[PDB]
């Protein structure tokens, strides 16, 4: 299905939508998040490690290093590969959705998150990366909102069928209609 | 002076069983630690000074990160975190005493990620975020460590002792046991 037709951008990051006479307000940041999670999750989209131009070498504490080692397998399932020596880790590849992020901030952030876990699972790591570590977004445009919803419709069919309250809300016309008649 | 009571024993590697005027309680040492550090980092709740690193930490930042840092510069300086910025990078020149022995190559990027998502910047709010992201103190707490921590918390956070939140301290009900003995 579909969220409908994008009508206009509301308050820099929402999209006013129309579907069968119904008007809705959708949060683009929330939609972007669901999209990224699906694109990063093995089993919901193609996952292929992408080589870094220049590998990112980082110093890590022993507890971080140890966390990285236990997570190696989960990370590789996400397309995140690295090698490491005594005091460092060097990121050699990341999945496509991450290739254009600022990895000098994202990876150290991922490392901090990983150093706090007891269990490592690609699914939960993808979700975390999708919600917290990714590129913030400035003013949204129509072209961007249109593209986003289309991608979300394609990869997250379920969101369409049952959109949470933080994703899309009903814009009630009854008051205006009544006010026009009355 | 006012206190949480007498430390009786360590429970679950990170909690402390307390006794105060006949009442028994369980206190989360990690939570107590976070309040202590939050206090040590908050201007007005404890002394704050800027200590230079012997090796400035340079980091690449996105326009959005760059911008966020710009807006938070004053609040950060109040916390003793000083930095310089050039086109694409920022260089941390100094950090408060409680952050000297941390993994800044991980913590600063996390702080930057956190700041990039804020709209309002206040030293108090930022210090709270920092205290919650410092690497967990110990792992297996000892009696001496808990006794020392609590004495410090008592002097720097007198209000916690008066109104200990439920995340910090919980009552251990002896009534069932007393009834059972009967
Ligand atoms: Cl537009
Ligand atoms: Cl447009
Ligand atoms: Na970021």
Swiss-Prot record, chain B:
It comes from the Bacteria. Belongs to the DNA mismatch repair MutL/HexB family. This protein is involved in the repair of mismatches in DNA. It is required for dam-dependent methyl-directed DNA mismatch repair. May act as a 'molecular matchmaker', a protein that promotes the formation of a stable complex between two or more DNA-binding proteins in an ATP-dependent manner without itself being part of the final effector complex. The ATPase activity of MutL is stimulated by DNA. This is DNA mismatch repair protein MutL. It comes from Escherichia coli (strain K12). The gene is mutL.
């Amino acid at each position: 299905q579909s969220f409908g037709r994008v009508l206009t951008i509301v308050h820099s990051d929402c999209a006013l939508l129309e579907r069968d006479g119904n008007i809705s307000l959708l949060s683009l940041p929330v939609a972007e998040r669901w999209l990224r999670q699906a694109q990063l999750t093995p089993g919901e989209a193609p996952v292929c490690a992408q080589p870094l131009l220049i590998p990112l070498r980082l110093k890590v504490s022993a507890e971080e290093k140890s966390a990285l080692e236990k997570a190696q397998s989960a990370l590789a399932e996400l397309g995140i590969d690295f090698q490491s020596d005594a005091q460092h880790v060097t990121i050699r590849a990341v999945p496509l959705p991450l290739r254009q992020q600022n990895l000098q901030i994202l990876i150290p952030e991922l490392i901090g998150y990983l150093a706090k876990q007891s269990v490592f699972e690609p699914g939960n790591i993808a979700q975390w990366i999708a919600r917290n570590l990714m590129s913030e977004h400035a003013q949204w445009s129509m072209a961007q909102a249109i593209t986003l919803l289309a991608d979300v419709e394609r990869l997250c069919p379920q969101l369409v069928k049952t959109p949470p309250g933080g994703l899309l809300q009903s814009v009630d016309l009854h008051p205006a209609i009544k006010a026009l008649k009355d």
